[PDB]
Design a protein around this ligand. Sequence first.
Ligand SMILES: CCCCCCCCCCCCO[C@@H]1O[C@H](CO)[C@@H](O[C@H]2O[C@H](CO)[C@@H](O)[C@H](O)[C@H]2O)[C@H](O)[C@H]1O
Ligand SMILES: CCCCCCCCS[C@@H]1O[C@H](CO)[C@@H](O)[C@H](O)[C@H]1O
Ligand SMILES: CCCCCCCCS[C@@H]1O[C@H](CO)[C@@H](O)[C@H](O)[C@H]1O
Ligand SMILES: CC(C)C[C@H](N)C(=O)O
Ligand code: NA
Ligand code: NA
Length: 441
Amino acid sequence: GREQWASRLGFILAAMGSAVGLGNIWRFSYVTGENGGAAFLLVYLGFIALIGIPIVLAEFTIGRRAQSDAVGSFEKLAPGKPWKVAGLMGVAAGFLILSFYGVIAGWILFYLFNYITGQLWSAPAEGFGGFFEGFIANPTLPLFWQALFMIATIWIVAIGVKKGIERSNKILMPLLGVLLIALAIYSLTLGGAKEGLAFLFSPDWSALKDPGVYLAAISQAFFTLSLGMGALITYGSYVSKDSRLPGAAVSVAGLDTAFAIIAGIMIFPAVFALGLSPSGGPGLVFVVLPDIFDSIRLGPIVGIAFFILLGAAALSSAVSLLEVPVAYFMRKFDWSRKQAAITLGVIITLLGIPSSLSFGVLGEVTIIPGLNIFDSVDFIASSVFLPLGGMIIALFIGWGWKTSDALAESDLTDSVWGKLWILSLRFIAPIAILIVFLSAF
Ligand SMILES: CCCCCCCCCCCCO[C@@H]1O[C@H](CO)[C@@H](O[C@H]2O[C@H](CO)[C@@H](O)[C@H](O)[C@H]2O)[C@H](O)[C@H]1O
Ligand SMILES: CCCCCCCCS[C@@H]1O[C@H](CO)[C@@H](O)[C@H](O)[C@H]1O
Ligand SMILES: CCCCCCCCS[C@@H]1O[C@H](CO)[C@@H](O)[C@H](O)[C@H]1O
Ligand SMILES: CC(C)C[C@H](N)C(=O)O
Ligand code: NA
Ligand code: NA
């Protein structure tokens, strides 16, 4: 008696709700800002089309065919084979990513609280940078705001696939999109549009000589798509026998890429208008956007609505993160859904506390040479586990299945896209990820 998405539209909304989150605005802004902008963008865009779309389809195909969790989908489709390592790494990557994801999601609830309590309406004397720096440097407060978010994340995954994840507000993600477009229009009028549009859309190939911008591009590509973390295999697992998988893949990435491009038109024109540097770091959007909201007469209302819609999309992305280990520990250890959700949830919360302290007391502590605790947990998950875990998934469909099985389960039997899709999984994606791995390291 295994669960499945009750409604018909629930699967694509859940996958979109998984993809559209903090990686589109927070991470995309500062990863693009410190990687040169336009040149990094085109490489990132080319990775999404060539590699992101096939892997999104590939993860959908594995889960729907096997109807099991992340690891058990490889045990059923290929028993006694080492392909399951991609499922193991994905479970670990979701564990690592969720730990610091809730921390950033704690920053959002804290800013939402301030707007709701009239704090951040006008500019504090320390400035929005000093207010942000002073808040992240505080040890206790972000832990408290990380906890509240994880509780809501735990609450939803414990309720179930049908009653919780499936039952979500359809309006919030378009509301967020409507709010981003309106904010993008306003940012063009601030005076830094030309400076920002040049940084964002005029390629400077000088920054392309470093092979690290490809690694950072493939990292943001897989992060924003929820790939390599067992999410889409799991959301594909609860899918009925008849459903259109290819169009879901293009809708997920197409909508997601639309949400990321608009986030660049809002941030970078606003960055240059304030005279800031695009390579500030993780707190780029937390120091820029409050500056921009304060320029608005009704900015407090804009800020309240902004951190509500963004917080809900971050809520749906973390729910898709927590669902992967819960699904594994349910089948493996016979844990109840509530027990697995609370246990893993509190565990991942404690694992994310070291990432939160790296912005304050633990700033000078590094694990990977030159990278603090937060940058090292992110780098291992995003830049190492996600591509390497995604390469094996591609090789799994390209060389572990017979072609008729892949095209049939992917519904690409009678189309030209099946030929280009198999080409990408067998050669394009695994070789390109390999070349990026060899070049960066
Ligand atoms: C409204 C925010 C998003 C909705 C989710 C929150 C619902 C739960 C509301 C009760 C929990 C709020 O928890 C709240 O955390 C803030 C820290 O930011 C505490 O605030 C504390 O530090 C802040 C700094 O921002 C000071 O301005 C404040 O004087 C001090 O009390 C509040 O004392 C506490 O009440
Ligand atoms: C909403 C869509 C915005 C698209 C922006 C595209 C990038 C424009 S960069 C462009 O570079 C030229 C020199 O190369 C300068 O002469 C121009 O003044 C400057 O604008
Ligand atoms: C969907 C994404 C579409 C992005 C389109 C961006 C086009 C800007 S190209 C840019 O144009 C300048 C002139 O304006 C030239 O001076 C630059 O050398 C050249 O690089
Ligand atoms: C880890 C993922 C759930 C993050 C999500 N894909 C985002 O773009 O925010
Ligand atoms: Na995304
Ligand atoms: Na989301």
